[PDB]
């Protein structure tokens, strides 16, 4: 009787509308992404949809910035609204600052804005999960941003459905600074190792990034090699 | 493997077999139904134009027998036939889910119905407990019948007794319980053609209990 | 084809037979009802003076055998009569859905009333078990009477009893048999004209569950 | 045509009949309601002061018949006057909305009431089955008697038994029969008096469930 | 029990409020289009009604623009008020950038629109689709704006009560850069395989529009050819 | 249990609020109106009333210009609100484009006024339909505003409680470019065929524009004419 | 269930909030008026009450203006709310136009105050019914304002808990242009046949006005003649 | 089921809220004035307390102006914020008109301020009633203020749990123009008339004002003469 | 099923809301004052709590100025932002008078602000009740403010759990102008006959002001005297 509102606390102490928005996020598919030596990267499981899509617009992985890119999970159309104002705090800062200086408090724009929702009544908060990829002053970043505003800076992690598998393989196999090839094929096993028996791994877009360089997206055919 | 098990019962009973169960009741079911209550029609004024003696309690009247015998028949593949559908429909109330209930009430309330039409189908004596309403008589016709005449039988064979109205309450028997017989076939014409119209119009919800076509919101 | 056997059903029985029936209750019935309780009240007075004693106790009275069997004609009739608008109604509940359920509760309104009137037209003996309304007596009042006046018959006859009180008893049986047959039909026409004002009130609803011009809003 | 037979309903059993009804029950029935009391007073004492023999089993007290059959004849006379007042109401329950209830919840409160009454004029036996209140015996006050009197004088009569309790039973059945009669008489008055006050306060709402002055609002 | 408000999430975490004005949508008439070599058509349905009604303003395709142009399916009221501000919006885009640039951000302003008010309290969503087609300096465009502002870059699609089975006739038929009039009747036997039996499809508003080239609609003698 | 806010919709998708505003605008007397050879009339039933009223008052038609009219039917006060704001709107449109040039977007205007309150919380919207006609720069016009705001550009409808029946008979016997009599005569007919059994057409108030005139009003004794 | 709120509809269609408060005004005592030859006059019953009363403030008639005056029935604070409006409302009128050169929109700006609070929740609407009545640039005039905000303008009305009895003598015995005199003895004769047996018809206030002159109320002995 | 809201009839027409306003005035102790020949009293009846209150602050009567003053029965908090507002509004009266010219409309400020909140949801009213009492320009003025808001300018009245009795006893007793002294000793008997059997009368405050004076208050021991 | 909200009248006519925040005043620990000859005193009972905490924020008594100074009982939150409060009330007296002149409206600013909280939805009351104490123009003060905001001067009070036994003794024992050491000894024996059996009077805080005086507080050892 508990669950109805944002605003009220269970005698326990819990926010189960807050709980429901991370189970809306947990119905969305599984999106991956780990630092290495000098970069980041990002894997992103798609099933493979009808062909009349343009394949431009189902991407899950965006680019907020040559230098800051992130994926969702989730609710399609909060995660569209939420992907809209990471870019536009991205602009913000850059021109408040200069330069994107430092990819955390683009995430902290993002988090203090879910954050906000889980808060007040009359506003429901938003389903989406987002992992921050990106090179800064300091260097590989690599964040995740929950639907109560939680943000964490990680050295590998998912969301999704799979989440708690991927980083259950990741927590026992992977090990840092990776020459980015191997980096991305001991994700696509973590990937692999998330789908249910029978499912067969379709190709996922994965896209990266090295220390002094911008962002590329593995297109179609270089991700067809791993697989 | 469970969804083996599953998909094992689904195909078993299915709603093709439902469906041929509801095409049989709207033809045959229903002229048997009419047929009964025509012969209980003509056994009652039968019965009726009649005065008795001594000699009508030395034998049944196996005509009555009949009639009770095939009424009782027809109770029991029309609960069988129910009972199929009833099986139907259990096989595939989904999750229990504390949303997401809108066909699952659907299905709650076709087995509602079906309740009634079973409950009303399987037999009962006048139980004297019930403050609803008071089944006619069901699967138990022929055996009711032959209690209370064979209680009268005894007090008027024995020496016999003396009450004129004793005979006249056999007379009573014969005519009250085809007259008995002749209710009941009409509101189990009711219940059933009730229940025909239930399922041709919620079987689309009965069978998906929900649609999902979530990978459109959720991605 | 699923359309065509509720097409089949509805057609079978539709709104004229309803309303044919209801016009056969606004006349015929309630003047028989009327005519029955006439009969009921000249044969309590019958009843009344008079004085008994061995002698009535052996031959029924034929005259109040055929009132109660009037009556009991007269229930089996306007249970049929009241069976037929039931099922009228009960083939036009549509689809189950959370909502829209306006005119669905007129029909559970005025099938919960002919409830009563068929449960107070319906037989049962005093069954000693419901803290309502006790009913008067229906389809089993010949039934009854005979089992109440053949154990007196049984006491009085044998030699016999000595009794005054058992004799009075009997006495006691037939007038007040008769008093419960005028009660049952006052009440019967209570009940009749009130279903007769719910149905002509409600009919419009009771074919048209609710009305669909969605094309208007919707396009 | 509809409308015709609703108003030949409403022009049959309309306000005056029920008023008159009313007029009737607020003078004569209260006054008859108290003599029968003060009989039963009077023949309770009359009970009070005397002690049985063998003699008092071999005849029945026509006084206590002659008190219980005016009773009897009261109830039955309340009970058809209350009736006449249910018809009255029912025929004037308008088109089952699911707003506009206000009259209409007045309505099935007075009915209610009149339940109340007839359920506690109507007669039944010690059922043992109801929680609530035993209603106090009602029409069959004579027949209770006879039948609780004749058991006793049975098991007098025969040889016969020779328990003193038994003869001390059957003055019991006759000072406590008698009390009863006092006892439902006293309650009855309450209850009538209650329903003249109900209609009397509540009879504009009970003739027009609802006033219509939409033309001021809609046009 | 929650399918009451907008804003409150079910334990699975699902907005069943959402999902009912997608429900609504459902009741309209079914209307389909796609691209081809050179220019995107849009294909409507319309049972025929009272010929008391002028044609004009029976349209559920309406031109936003020379060069922008949509259909709805739905509630009519919103339907008006949805192509009113796109309309508005289109103006605004042309005057802020001197021309309609791209479409996809008129369709983003009409996105974020009826994305709003499936968030906060006190407001219902909008119960209609939208289906925006056009060239633009990139070429044929060709969207689908849902109730909860989902949108998505299409090559073919529907809305509406047949949705799902032209879009399941066009996911197994359609091939690209069709020249113009094959395309119409593909898309033609695409609305008839969406009807039920009995049913003969009337005539439906059809119109196109090729690169360099303003919109026209087909009258109904050029839409009588493909019957 | 749905049909409590103006907010939420069935598992349908209905909105049963506004579908009672509908039927609140049902309980109104007909009336009804239609386009000729060079203009468009209208016809209003008024079962009369006391002749303490002063007849200037009870007028269902009414003018919001010398050449834009129109007629109510539902609850008499947002009836009477709505055809002021229907004056203002006319006025305010005329002094912004120096005449009214185009009846349509004073309609326009009423339209999106009656619309707005069918979506806000807090606020119940106008039990009224309204039936505009006039003469513009194009010609003869004639609407019908429903309280949903749903507009509609005819050429003949009613209004009110017979207004399926006359749209019935129009539907079956309108013909268009009567001249104006013979026009008025057939929708006096129409309006005579939606009454009940016994009941005697009293003298309804009817009125007319052509082009290049303002309007008039007949008066009773020219009505009575065609009783 | 639905008589709780202002804004919620009935299926039927009704507005019962609305309805109760028009059943409010009906608890209040009976008020009457009509117009004559050259004028309009007042009439209202006062049960008298106690003699610690300054007769001063018990006065259901008010003077609004010199040349307008009116009178309530149904709550007394309401009503008190009400006339203050009237009065504010004249002298805004008087001010913009030099003179209150029209009743009748003084009786609007009353009319769309009553009406609003009949459409918003959070607000309860006026339970007082009021009749206007005075001389303008046209003439005698005599309006009533019902909680709903209905304006009418008559020849003859009531208000109050007699109001169908007193509206049911004038509508079968009020002949127009009546002398002054005459005019107040018919109306008298109109509140005595509202009353119960029994009840004895006190003294009650009345008022007139002639074209060219202001107001006056004539004294209670002056009163006390048409006994 | 309606006592609940303040802004809701029930379907007799009643504000049960405002009632139960008013019943709770009923809780407070008696108080009661009247005016004679050329001036007005104010007599209240004080239960003694305990000693330990400084006998300042347990004043009923309290002085607005030099020349207006009044007394509260009800709730004590919402008490002092009326009197507080009584002397705001005289001040702002007396600034912008040079003078309290007349008390009446101070009595207007403050009832208007009471009635406000019998209209408006989110809100309850004051639970309070005031006797106002002084000299202006006409001379002696006596009012009440009830919760509603609803002002009456009397000769004599109460307010409190005895109301009902002292006005009982001053309408057949009361004769106007008494001197002083006589008028006070009748008041005092008629707040003696008010209590229950066994209770004795302590002593009262009571004050005054004659045409052309101030007010004073009488002391205890000029008090303690009329026991 | 009305003790839910603030702002509804029982059909006593009663606040339960305002008394459940004077109940929970009431959980809170006992603290007394009271005036004598040339100033006033507070008495404070503390139960000893954890060594840990810093004896310098436990103390309920708080200098409000040098010359006012009170104490609270009840929530500790509210209890902090209401002498918060008082402070810049006194600092906004003090600036726009040139000094705190008089107590009483330092005591009406906190009032009315604790007031004003009993009479607005989506507002709970302060759970609070303050006892101000002080030395102005005037002389010694000493008020009392409870949660519904009413104040009252007194020549001696307490609050809290003991203050019925405290108001009791002081009641029947309380003799004014006692040299300050006497009313310090009366005091605690007030305070001491407020506990249960078998309960110890711990050190409570003791502090004073005199005519011409600052405060001081009775540091522990001086309280430790009159143990």
Known sequence: ?227 | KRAALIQNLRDSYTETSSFAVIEEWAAGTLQEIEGIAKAAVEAHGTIRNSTYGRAQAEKSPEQLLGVLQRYQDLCHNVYCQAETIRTVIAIRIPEHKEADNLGVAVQHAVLKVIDELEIKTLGSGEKSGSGGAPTPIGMYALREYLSARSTVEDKLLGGGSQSPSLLLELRQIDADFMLKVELATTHLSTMVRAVINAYLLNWKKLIQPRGGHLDVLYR
Chains 1, 5, 6, 7, 8, 9 share one sequence.
């Open chain 1, 1 to 227: 009787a508990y669950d109805r509102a944002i605003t009220v606390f269970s005698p326990d102490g819990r926010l189960f509308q807050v709980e429901y928005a991370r189970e809306a996020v947990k119905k969305g598919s599984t999106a991956l992404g780990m630092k290495f030596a000098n970069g980041v990267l990002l894997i992103s499981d798609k099933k493979v949809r009808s062909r009349l899509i343009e394949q431009n617009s189902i991407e899950k992985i965006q680019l907020i910035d040559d230098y800051v890119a992130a994926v969702t999970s989730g609710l399609v159309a909060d995660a569209r609204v939420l992907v809209d104002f990471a870019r536009i705090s991205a602009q913000q800062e850059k021109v408040t600052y200069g330069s994107l200086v430092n990819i955390e408090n683009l995430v902290k724009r993002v988090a203090d804005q879910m954050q906000q929702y889980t808060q007040y009544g009359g506003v429901r908060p938003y389903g989406v999960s987002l992992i921050f990829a990106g090179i800064d002053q300091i260097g590989p970043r690599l964040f995740d941003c929950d639907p109560a505003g939680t943000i964490n800076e990680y050295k590998a992690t998912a969301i999704g459905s799979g989440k708690d598998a991927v980083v259950s393989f990741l927590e026992r196999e992977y090990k840092e600074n990776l020459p980015e090839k191997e980096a991305v094929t001991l994700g696509i096993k973590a990937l692999k190792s998330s789908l249910e028996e029978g499912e067969e791994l379709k190709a996922p877009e994965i896209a990266s990034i090295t220390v002094g360089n911008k962002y590329r997206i593995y297109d179609q055919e270089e991700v067809k090699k791993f697989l």
